[PDB]
Amino acid sequence: TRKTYAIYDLLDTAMINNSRNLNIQLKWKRPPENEAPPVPFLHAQRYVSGYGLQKGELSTLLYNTHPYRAFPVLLLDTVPWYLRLYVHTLTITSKGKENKPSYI
Amino acid sequence: AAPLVLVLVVAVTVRAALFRSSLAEFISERVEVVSPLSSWKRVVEGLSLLDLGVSPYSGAVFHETPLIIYLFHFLIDYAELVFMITDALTAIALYFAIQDFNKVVFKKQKLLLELDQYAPDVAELIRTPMEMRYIPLKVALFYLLNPYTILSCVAKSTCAINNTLIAFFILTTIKGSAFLSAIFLALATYQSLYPLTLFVPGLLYLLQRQYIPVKMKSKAFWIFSWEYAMMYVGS
Ligand SMILES: CC(C)CCC[C@@H](C)[C@H]1CC[C@H]2[C@@H]3CC=C4C[C@@H](OC(=O)CCC(=O)O)CC[C@]4(C)[C@H]3CC[C@]12C
Ligand SMILES: CC(C)CCC[C@@H](C)[C@H]1CC[C@H]2[C@@H]3CC=C4C[C@@H](O)CC[C@]4(C)[C@H]3CC[C@]12C
Ligand SMILES: CC(C)CCC[C@@H](C)[C@H]1CC[C@H]2[C@@H]3CC=C4C[C@@H](O)CC[C@]4(C)[C@H]3CC[C@]12C
Ligand SMILES: *[C@@H]1O[C@H](CO)[C@@H](O)[C@H](O)[C@H]1NC(C)=O
């Protein structure tokens, strides 16, 4: 994205001298609902499913908010030994259909 | 004849009815019914690990023998039929073994009578043919209609196959074949370790059937014992 920055050069003696210091001020409030920037193209969440003290499930949600482009992601998970995992129960679903990973 | 078939039909019907209900998933996860060495979910986990290129024994979840892997590799689709077949098999083996044993018992008890080694007033302790008629059918019914066995069957626990192997060991022993007896005892020891303790009773029964005396200064006893032990260990 094209971004504009204001630069304060502290080595310039026009900016900072012995007789005058620097205090920068900035006016900003939460913008109205309209004119707010769009959400990023990628974000994710993680949670635990079930109840009790015997069995459960670990779930992750991945979002693609781009209008027309698909892109790949690489996912890394580490789990302690006490939570024993069953790999024949692993499922990946997009839009109600099964998604087959290229590498695992 | 008809009673045994009727018992089998009722047992199979109850198992088939319970396989289709909404309690199968609840039953399959009881800690009283499955173990780290019996669960069906560990079977499917090991089979999946083999298809991911990982050794099934490189983790901490799968503790089954390779023969189970082979069998269920070829029969994963027909799983629910296998357990019904195995339960019927163990029931039938017990039935026929008990028939033969009762014959031996009555014949042995009858032989003592003429050697008059029993006390004068001991009657109503004597076995009679009318009371031993329905013992085998009962034995089959007690195995098949026990709630423990039905629970084990619906959960698809591996313990059923072990029970079948033990029952076949008993059947082959009472029928008098030592080679098959040693084979089945070896297959039972391969699956679980503890059945090796049943070596002594079967050897004693075989020796008694041969009419060989059991003494420290006997020759037939030692030869028979050596042959039986060699067959078992080789198996
Ligand atoms: C006790 C430990 C070493 C375990 C191994 C058992 C051995 C002590 C067994 C194996 C073979 C046995 C022998 C097999 C045959 C005989 C012959 C038996 O006598 C006869 O056969 C005589 C025949 C007759 O004249 O009627 C006397 C015992 C003896 C020496 C047995 C003594 C006990 C032996 C050595
Ligand atoms: C073939 C495999 C898969 C299963 C075998 C099961 C059937 C065929 C076996 C199991 C137990 C067997 C029985 C065991 C004992 C006896 C007593 C004997 O005096 C006559 C045969 C008879 C009656 C056998 C007939 C065959 C039998 C019923
Ligand atoms: C794989 C499963 C189905 C087992 C099949 C039957 C097995 C147990 C059979 C196949 C070959 C058999 C062996 C063949 C030869 C001998 C030598 C003999 O002096 C003692 C028995 C012994 C050692 C047999 C024991 C039983 C045995 C191992
Ligand atoms: C910084 O100090 C110098 C020297 O006193 C002075 O000339 C200058 O004006 C000061 N800062 C400003 C206002 O540029």
Curated annotation (Swiss-Prot), chain A:
Substitution effect: N17Q: No effect on function in GPI-anchor attachment to protein
Compartment(s) of residence: Endoplasmic reticulum membrane
Record's comment on post-translational modification: The disulfide bond between PIGK/GPI8 and PIGT is important for normal enzyme activity.
Consequence when changing H66P: In MCAHS3; uncertain significance
Glycosites: N17
Family: Belongs to the PIGT family.
Disease cited in the entry: Multiple congenital anomalies-hypotonia-seizures syndrome 3: An autosomal recessive syndrome characterized by distinct facial features, intellectual disability, hypotonia and seizures, in combination with abnormal skeletal, endocrine, and ophthalmologic findings including impaired vision, as well as abnormal motility of the eyes. Paroxysmal nocturnal hemoglobinuria 2: A disorder characterized by hemolytic anemia with hemoglobinuria, thromboses in large vessels, and a deficiency in hematopoiesis. Red blood cell breakdown with release of hemoglobin into the urine is manifested most prominently by dark-colored urine in the morning.
Subunit (UniProt): Heteropentamer. Part of the GPI-anchor transamidase complex, consisting of PIGK, PIGT, PIGS, PIGU and GAA1.
Annotated function: Component of the glycosylphosphatidylinositol-anchor (GPI-anchor) transamidase (GPI-T) complex that catalyzes the formation of the linkage between a proprotein and a GPI-anchor and participates in GPI anchored protein biosynthesis. May play a crucial role in GPI-T complex assembly in the luminal layer. Binds GPI-anchor.
Full protein name: GPI-anchor transamidase component PIGT
Organism: Homo sapiens
Location of this fragment in the whole protein: 311 to 414 of 578
UniProtKB/Swiss-Prot annotation, chain B:
Outcome of substituting F224A: No effect on function in GPI-anchor attachment to protein
Topological domain ranges for the Lumenal compartment: 22-77
Segments on the Cytoplasmic face: 1-2, 99-135, 205-221
Effect on the protein upon substituting Y143A: No effect on function in GPI-anchor attachment to protein
Lineage: superkingdom: Eukaryota
Record note on what altering P66A does: No effect on function in GPI-anchor attachment to protein
Pathway connected to this protein: Glycolipid biosynthesis; glycosylphosphatidylinositol-anchor biosynthesis
Record's bilayer topology term: Multi-pass membrane protein
Main location: endoplasmic reticulum
Keywords associated with the record: Disease variant, Endoplasmic reticulum, Epilepsy, GPI-anchor biosynthesis, Intellectual disability, Membrane, Transmembrane, Transmembrane helix
GO CC aspect terms: endoplasmic reticulum membrane; GPI-anchor transamidase complex; membrane; plasma membrane
Residues involved in a cardiolipin binding: K215, M216
Subcellular location(s) of the protein: Endoplasmic reticulum membrane
UniProt keyword Nuclease present: no
GO biological processes: attachment of GPI anchor to protein; GPI anchor biosynthetic process; GPI anchored protein biosynthesis; regulation of receptor signaling pathway via JAK-STAT
Residues annotated as transmembrane: 3-21, 78-98, 136-157, 158-177, 178-193, 194-204, 222-235
Gene Ontology MF term list: GPI anchor binding; GPI-anchor transamidase activity
Protein role: Component of the glycosylphosphatidylinositol-anchor (GPI-anchor) transamidase (GPI-T) complex that catalyzes the formation of the linkage between a proprotein and a GPI-anchor and participates in GPI anchored protein biosynthesis. Binds the lipid portion of GPI-anchor. May act as an organizer in the transmembrane layer to recruit other subunits, and thus is essential for assembly of the complex.
Disease per UniProt entry: Neurodevelopmental disorder with brain anomalies, seizures, and scoliosis: An autosomal recessive disorder characterized by global developmental delay, severe-to-profound intellectual disability, muscular hypotonia, seizures, brain anomalies, including thin corpus callosum and cerebellar atrophy, scoliosis, and mild facial dysmorphism.
Similarity field: Belongs to the PIGU family.
Subunit details: Heteropentamer. Part of the GPI-anchor transamidase complex, consisting of PIGK, PIGT, PIGS, PIGU and GAA1.
Protein name: GPI-anchor transamidase component PIGU
UniProt organism field: Homo sapiens
